[PDB]
Design a protein around this ligand. Structure first.
Ligand SMILES: [Mg+2]
Ligand SMILES: [Mg+2]
Ligand SMILES: [Mg+2]
Ligand SMILES: [Mg+2]
Ligand SMILES: [Mg+2]
Ligand SMILES: [Mg+2]
Ligand SMILES: [Mg+2]
Ligand SMILES: [Mg+2]
Ligand SMILES: [Mg+2]
Ligand SMILES: [Mg+2]
Ligand SMILES: [Mg+2]
Ligand SMILES: [Mg+2]
Ligand SMILES: [Mg+2]
Ligand SMILES: [Mg+2]
Ligand SMILES: [Mg+2]
Lengths: 19, 51, 128, 124, 63, 216, 225, 109
RNA sequence: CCACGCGUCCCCCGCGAGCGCACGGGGUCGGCGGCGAUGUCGGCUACCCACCCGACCCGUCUUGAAACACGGACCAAGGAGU
RNA sequence: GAGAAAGAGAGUGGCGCGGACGCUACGCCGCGACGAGUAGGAGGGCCGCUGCGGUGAGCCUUGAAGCCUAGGGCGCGGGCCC
């Protein structure tokens, strides 16, 4: 999750999951 | 940048290592709890010695 | 009310005593002006304890407080009245001195022009 | 050009003056009067200058025009402003900003105009 | 103190040309800018070669 | 909006809350609290209507100006500092003033003023010391207390009341407050034997008398 | 129009902020796992000593692989072989210190320098306090004090060393990239020992201070640090 | 109406054997002769009081001839309760063996 | 407990907003008190004197000079890599 | 300044007129580590002397050079200004 290229969609999904 | 001392200064230690917050919380809770346990055992042994 | 500068720092000086050239107290033919001595047995050049000190670079003043008068200003030697419209802009950092050669009837005009242009003169009442 | 003239003027001009660990330039269109490429008022195609009037009231503001660069007589245009301190500075501010006329030194022109005005109001 | 020997503590290479030519110094004023603000090392090599001496920029011939 | 609550973390030590981030998520109940999504006035002039511009441009400019400082954080002003006392100074203890014109004299302590200073009267019937401020550090605090838990100092006296104005004249409310607080203090120290003589006397160091050897 | 430019740069700033927040949760849980690892490493040797004692046998523990070396004798009057090995140990000033992993080459290197150094086996508190108090990094061959995790992550991130806890972990538990982490660490500048040395010139066995103090280096780090 | 300063004697400067450092006074305070007892006097205001020829000012009073050089008491010095001190101006060596007052008022009690 | 949703396909079992405190990229006070026109205030430096510590006279030849090694009473001007 | 080779890149379809300083680029600014020195080598002098070409619409009998000074000062220093 925490490195940029391969965790981009995972950070996007947890950003949506905050909402 | 002025190098502050992470052993003395707290939020610099947290900036370098955010798990130090929960370590230094759990050890305060642990030491306070062990302290009240030893005080309760000392009071119990003193009451049993009084009897 | 004097003409106070813009900023007035704490001028720390590392050394206030001058550098006496070695054995200037002794003879009269030796003037007090420092010369580093090139002796082979010289007690000063090899810097023994309790001797005349040597002017190293480390005694140099801070660059922010270098060439700075105790009032906070820096000198600027002025000959005629046309060399004060130069300091028209540097009003709060740089002050004016009038040269020793300048006559009285021109020093008067210099002092009144600097009083108009708000420039401190270090010696405003020199000859009169 | 400009940089070519600067690489000659920078250490050889007779307006340059060097003493007491300072340096200056006594040329007639030098805001802040210091020796720089930015503030030199001879080596540029466009240049402002702020001077006191020959009369003891106001400020003459000097602009360098576009066309007559090699014609020194009809090169500078001089406008004498004799009014209050706020509108004098607003006039110089509009004159430099909204013409886009060398905006490097609008603030230096405003500082010099205010210095002339405080020297020109009567001395206490 | 430190156990450091100070023989080669200073690089010998140039920072500027030793000419008081002004056209070469305007070229240097341009290529300092292009050397520090591009990521092409052609600008660094040509900056170094404007810096050099007459004998280290020898005349290349047309042939 | 809602009514503001107090801190749900009880403070464990300074800078550490007693509850972790998940437990404080639970105590705040953030699982169910999600969310998703000037310069001109127009005035009439008897002309037309003029557009007056408040906050006008400056008239003058200094010929060169200082730059803006960098921004540092922990440097509060004096009026909102935290104020500390020593453990040996409690309301009712007797003090030995060491510095001013009332040096050496023993004094009943009243309360902590809002500006760090101590409120003081060794009562003026005894050693001629009024309702005066003093500094905490400049005072020896002996181990002799009186129980003033039931006295009422007037609340209208603070640092703003004892602050110097600008010869000095005693006002009338100084005398009234003096008698009003002495009528509460002085019968409570006449209850302790030999205490009024102790407050009338002064402190001194004689021969063979050293402060580090003597407790007080 | 700009109404898409502002919202795009807001989304980009938010994206890198959420990236940074994910990195902070990463180094948090890595430090938790490291704490669990150190609990296991400390109790494992005790548990194996106990099972050997109740079986009647002995338990020779793991011969330690990490030492901390301090230069106690000054610049002047050094044999050239000795000053070459002190240069390869990066001990140039007096009262410098470096971590050194142990093998057959390095033990003989420490032996050939032995009258000039005090070197021992540091514990986890020693490694912690040397890293946090005196630990700097050789970044662009400058000496930048390790005030943030990004100073470590920019230089050693390709060795999966992204925080100071990862640095401490590899130094203590000597890993694969111990050379690179150690050579990232600048030589430590310790103060003169409070309380003072008993004798500088003679060996620790004969009541001095030079030589292989084994784990009594954890008294001397506490008062040079 | 009595003395409010402890008695101390300016023993010397802080000195090595072939070097003295005049920025730090050495004060021998009367009565305390051990480091367990010197702890009360740390951080105290100490003062060297002397007279002169021509008058100087006096704060809260009339101009008179007495003068001072103020200072603090920094830290202990050796096992015998000797203490160090630092003064605003370094002391003249007139004062070797003269009564420096050590006040009480920077108090920690 | 640095764990928090809904929806589906597979296997084992990408912008939420505000305010605020601060062990947070180097000090500030949105705190004070005294004395000041004929005797006081500031001036480190430069004049004299006192005291503590230090302290052998330079140049040179020299392995090594304070040397019981040589040159030198003192001062002004001239005086040696052109 | 940001742990992660590389665009706050473009196109085609589904009221109030305002914003400090800077940049003698041979200038200014930021980081680190460093500082012994005879013979000797080198760099920089807005250190100093005399004269020449330029130049300061320079200074000067309303007092230049020189010299004296318990006066005020600047520079690490050569020296310099009142
Ligand atoms: Mg000799
Ligand atoms: Mg010799
Ligand atoms: Mg060194
Ligand atoms: Mg060398
Ligand atoms: Mg070299
Ligand atoms: Mg000690
Ligand atoms: Mg002696
Ligand atoms: Mg000879
Ligand atoms: Mg011989
Ligand atoms: Mg020889
Ligand atoms: Mg002999
Ligand atoms: Mg003979
Ligand atoms: Mg001979
Ligand atoms: Mg002779
Ligand atoms: Mg050197």
């Amino acid at each position: 999750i925490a490195h940029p290229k391969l965790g981009r969609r995972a950070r996007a999904r947890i950003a949506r999951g905050l909402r | 940048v002025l190098k502050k001392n992470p052993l003395k200064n707290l939020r610099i230690m947290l900036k370098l290592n955010p798990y130090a917050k929960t370590m230094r919380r759990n050890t305060i809770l642990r030491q306070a709890r062990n302290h009240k346990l030893r005080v309760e055992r000392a009071a119990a042994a003193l009451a049993a010695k009084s009897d | 009310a004097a003409l106070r500068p813009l900023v007035k720092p704490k001028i720390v000086k590392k050394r206030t005593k001058k550098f006496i050239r070695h054995q200037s107290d002794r003879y009269v033919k030796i003037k007090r002006n420092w010369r580093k001595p090139r002796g082979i047995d010289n007690r000063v050049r090899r810097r023994f304890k309790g001797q005349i000190l040597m002017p190293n670079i480390g005694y140099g003043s801070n660059k922010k407080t270098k060439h700075m008068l105790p009032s906070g200003f820096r000198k600027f030697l002025v000959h005629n009245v046309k060399e004060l419209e130069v300091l028209l802009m540097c009003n709060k950092s740089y002050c004016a001195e009038i040269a020793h050669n300048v006559s009285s009837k021109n020093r008067k005009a210099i002092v009144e022009r600097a009083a108009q242009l708000a420039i401190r003169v270090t010696n405003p009442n020199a000859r009169l | 050009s400009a940089h070519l003239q600067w690489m000659v003027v920078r250490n050889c001009s007779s307006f340059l003056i060097k003493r007491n660990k300072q340096t200056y330039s006594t040329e007639p269109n030098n805001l802040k009067a210091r020796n720089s490429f930015r503030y030199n008022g001879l080596i540029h195609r466009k240049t402002v200058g702020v001077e006191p009037a020959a009369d003891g009231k106001g400020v003459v503001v000097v602009m360098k025009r576009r066309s007559g660069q090699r014609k020194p007589a009809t090169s500078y245009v001089r406008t004498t402003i004799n009014k209050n301190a706020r509108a004098t500075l607003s006039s110089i501010r509009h004159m430099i900003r909204k013409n886009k006329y060398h905006p490097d030194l609008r603030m230096a022109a405003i500082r010099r105009a205010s210095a002339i005005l405080r020297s020109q109001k009567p001395v206490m | 103190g430190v156990d450091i020997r100070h023989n080669k503590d200073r690089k010998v290479r140039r920072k500027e040309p030793k000419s008081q030519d002004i056209y070469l110094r305007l070229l240097v004023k341009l290529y300092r800018f292009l050397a520090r603000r591009t990521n092409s090392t052609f600008n660094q090599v040509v900056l170094k070669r404007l810096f050099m001496s007459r004998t280290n920029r020898p005349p290349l011939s047309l042939s | 909006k809602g009514k503001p609550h107090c801190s749900r973390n009880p403070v464990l030590v300074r800078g550490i809350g007693r509850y972790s981030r998940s437990a404080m998520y639970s105590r705040k109940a953030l699982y169910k609290r999600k969310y998703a999504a000037l310069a001109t006035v127009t005035k009439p002039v008897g002309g037309g209507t003029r557009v007056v511009k408040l906050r006008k441009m400056p008239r003058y400019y200094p010929t060169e100006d200082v730059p803006r400082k960098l921004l540092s954080h922990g440097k509060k002003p004096f009026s909102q500092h935290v104020r500390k006392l020593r453990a040996s100074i409690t309301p009712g203890t007797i003090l030995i003033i060491l510095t001013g014109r009332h040096r050496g004299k023993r004094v009943v302590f009243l309360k902590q003023l809002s500006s760090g200073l101590l409120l003081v009267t060794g009562p003026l019937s005894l050693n001629r010391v009024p309702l005066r401020r003093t500094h905490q550090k400049f005072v020896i605090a002996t181990s002799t207390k009186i129980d003033i838990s039931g006295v009422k100092i007037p609340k209208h006296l603070t640092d703003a009341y004892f602050k110097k104005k600008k010869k000095y004249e005693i006002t009338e409310q100084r005398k009234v407050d003096q008698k009003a607080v002495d009528s509460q203090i002085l019968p409570k120290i006449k209850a302790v034997p030999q205490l009024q003589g102790y407050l009338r006397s002064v402190f001194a160091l004689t021969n063979g008398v050293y402060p580090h050897k003597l407790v007080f | 129009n700009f109404a898409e430019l502002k919202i795009k740069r807001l989304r980009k700033k938010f994206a890198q902020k959420m990236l940074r927040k994910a990195r902070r949760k990463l180094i948090y849980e890595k430090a938790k796992h490291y704490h669990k690892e150190y609990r296991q490493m400390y109790r494992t040797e005790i548990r194996m000593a106990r099972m050997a004692r109740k079986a009647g046998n002995f338990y020779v523990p793991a011969e330690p692989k990490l030492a901390f070396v301090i230069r106690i004798r000054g610049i002047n009057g050094v044999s050239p072989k000795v000053r070459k090995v002190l240069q390869l140990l990066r001990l140039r000033q007096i009262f410098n210190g470096t971590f050194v992993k142990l093998n057959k080459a390095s033990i003989n290197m420490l032996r050939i320098v032995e009258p000039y150094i005090a070197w021992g086996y540091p514990n986890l508190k020693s490694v912690n306090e040397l890293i946090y108090k005196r630990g700097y990094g050789k970044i662009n061959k400058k000496r930048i004090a390790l005030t943030d995790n990004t100073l470590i992550a920019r230089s050693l991130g390709k060795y999966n060393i992204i925080c100071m806890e990862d640095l401490i972990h590899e130094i203590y538990t000597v890993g694969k990239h111990f050379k690179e982490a150690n050579n990232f660490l600048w030589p430590f500048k310790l103060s003169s020992p409070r309380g003072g040395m008993k004798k500088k010139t003679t060996h620790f066995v004969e009541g001095g201070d030079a030589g292989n103090r084994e784990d009594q280096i954890n008294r001397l780090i506490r008062r040079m640090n | 109406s009595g003395r409010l300063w402890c008695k101390a004697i300016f023993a010397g400067y802080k000195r090595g054997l072939r070097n003295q450092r005049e920025h730090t006074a050495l004060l021998k305070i009367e009565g305390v002769y051990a480091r367990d007892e010197t702890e009360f006097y740390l951080g105290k205001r100490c003062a060297y009081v002397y007279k002169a020829k021509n008058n100087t000012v006096t704060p809260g009073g009339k101009p008179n001839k007495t003068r001072v050089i103020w200072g603090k008491v920094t830290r202990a010095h050796g096992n015998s309760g000797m203490v160090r001190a630092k003064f605003r101006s370094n002391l003249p060596a007139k004062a070797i063996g003269h009564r420096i007052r050590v006040m009480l008022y920077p108090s920690r009690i």
